[PDB]
Amino acid sequence: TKKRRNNGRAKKGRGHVQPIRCTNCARCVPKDKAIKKFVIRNIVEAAAVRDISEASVFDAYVLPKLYVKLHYCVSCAIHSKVVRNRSREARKDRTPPPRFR
Amino acid sequence: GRMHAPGKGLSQSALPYRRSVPTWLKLTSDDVKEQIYKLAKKGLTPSQIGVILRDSHGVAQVRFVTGNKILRILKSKGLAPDLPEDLYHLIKKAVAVRKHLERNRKDKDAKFRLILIESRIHRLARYYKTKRVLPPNWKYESSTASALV
């Protein structure tokens, strides 16, 4: 039977989209079908962010961040717990999880 | 609902209900006709006489002011062209696609586009055969169509 109305992708009027590889494996996944994660993160998070600050020559120097646009496949994201299975009524919800931490 | 396109657009003219002549128009039927004869003498397809007359001369419709329409007036005086205007512009468009296809023969999209006009030309060709405005043995020949502009 039909599990998803959009068949787990954003392709509606195209019919063909360019594939992209994965981060863990080299799986060829369509761009709209891939689970895309964009993570804003510092180079150092909790411990190394402190001791480098007094070790920095330039006082009051903000540490640069790192930007990585992640592209996971269906098997890779679920195994790495990026996304998880939901109930038939919980599938239709597509709002992002709340962001506070 | 275009017959050679998947588009279903709705955009065309809509004449008002009243067929009476406008109150701002003081040009009589013969003065409109001599204006029509002036535009037709210098070379102009009947589509364009109707265009510029409502722009500068301020006429609503030629059929309401005069007794006849634009092509019918030219047919009475013999100023109408040898072949109708919709077939002429289709042949002109078909020549340009074929001329473009001579250089860009890799253009498969333009190659597919070529059959559509020749499909559209033949529909107009056999229709005008039944209306007896074309000779019964007239046939659109692609190689000799470049002589006609």
């Binding site: - | 609902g1 004449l15 209900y17 067929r19």
Partner: protein
């Protein structure tokens, strides 16, 4: 494209009757449809209709009552003899107490009772009850 005109008019007012609209507009106006509407009005199945005669195919606004169940159309217009006209209404009308099959004859357009009175057959148009 629009092949049949009466078929589009009858189904448009049948969709409005199912929803129960007080009045309904049909986009084409034809002589057959006007004759079709006059057949139903003498029997009181619908409310009073009017046409808007512009300089094109006119538009007809038909007031509706709640007395209409279904007004169908039979395409193509099969010719109907006097012998099997009972056979046509057996498998089309709900009952013999009511239900009207209208069909065009040389005398005009009328229901199946009046065609029996004038003893004239013709081609079928549609059914309504």
């Amino acid at each position: 494209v629009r092949m049949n005109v009466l078929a589009d008019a009858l189904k448009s007012i049948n969709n409005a009757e199912k929803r129960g609209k007080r009045q309904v507009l049909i986009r084409p106006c034809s002589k057959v449809i006007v004759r079709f509407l006059t057949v139903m009005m003498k029997h009181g199945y619908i409310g009073e209709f009017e046409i808007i005669d512009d300089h094109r195919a006119g538009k007809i606004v038909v007031n509706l009552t709640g007395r209409l169940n279904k007004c169908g159309v039979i395409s193509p217009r099969f010719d109907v003899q006097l012998k099997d006209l009972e056979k046509w209404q057996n498998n089309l009308l709900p009952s013999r107490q009511f239900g009207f099959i209208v069909l065009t004859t040389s005398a005009g357009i009328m229901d199946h009772e009046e065609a029996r009175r004038k003893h004239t057959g013709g081609k079928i148009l549609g059914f309504f009850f």
